[PDB]
Amino acid sequence: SLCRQNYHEECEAGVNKQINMEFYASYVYMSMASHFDRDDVALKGAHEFFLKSSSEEREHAMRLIKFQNQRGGRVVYQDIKKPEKDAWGTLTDAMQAALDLEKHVNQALLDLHALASKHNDPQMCDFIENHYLTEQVEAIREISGYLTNLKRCGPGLGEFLFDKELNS
């Protein structure tokens, strides 16, 4: 490939892994969104919030695909595994699972940064810092505060009202 320069095969593989991981997170959120749109669950704020979250994760995957081609790597796709659950429970349960997901993705991003630092790839490090690491910190902090407020609001009416407040 005429464009490849200072791009190590381990970094290329790490990017292909993160691409799969972002699509996976996209799929989880899709599943959460459809769970909260069940007639017997019917939390329209959660639905909209997880649908938007699913769409954002697809963007994160797509920016990595682009990055792979910009640097002269080869994108290699794997299966996008189905999420661990078919039903995500209450809005509190789902938000806990979402926190776990974002932290898992955050840890993979930090391993990917560590890979790029290790192979002296400053452009890859900056790409990751600039587009992913601060976004991850905000999302985790965001979900964590929701969890605190879901426990403050309590079940029943509290969950209905916390749900109203989700998107604004």
Closest residue to Cl ion, judged by C-beta, is: 145
Binding-site partner at residue 126 among Na ion, Cl ion, Fe ion, none, CB < 5 to 8 Å by type:
Fe ion
Nearer to its own copies, 10 or 111 (CB): 111
The CA distances from residue 101 to 21, 24, 81, 140, in Å, are 10, 10, 14, 9
From Na ion, Fe ion, Cl ion, none, interface partner of 21 (C-beta below 5 to 8 A by class):
none
Closest CB 35 distance from its own copies, rounded Å:
8
Instruction: Tell which positions 84-123 bind Fe ion, by CB under 5 A.
Output: 90
Work out whether 35 is an interface residue with Fe ion (CB under 5 A): no
Q: Are 95 and 150 in contact (CB under 8 A)?
A: yes
Q: According to CB under 5 A, which one of 117, 129, 130, 165 is a site residue for Cl ion?
A: 117
Cα dihedral across residues 107, 112, 31, 159: positive or negative: positive
User: Which option in Na ion, Cl ion, Fe ion, none does residue 93 bind, with CB closer than 5 to 8 A by kind?
Assistant: Cl ion
HSE value, Cβ hemisphere, 13 Å, CA-based, for 110:
9
Taking the C-alpha atoms of residue 48 and residue 45, their distance in angstroms, rounded to an integer, is: 5
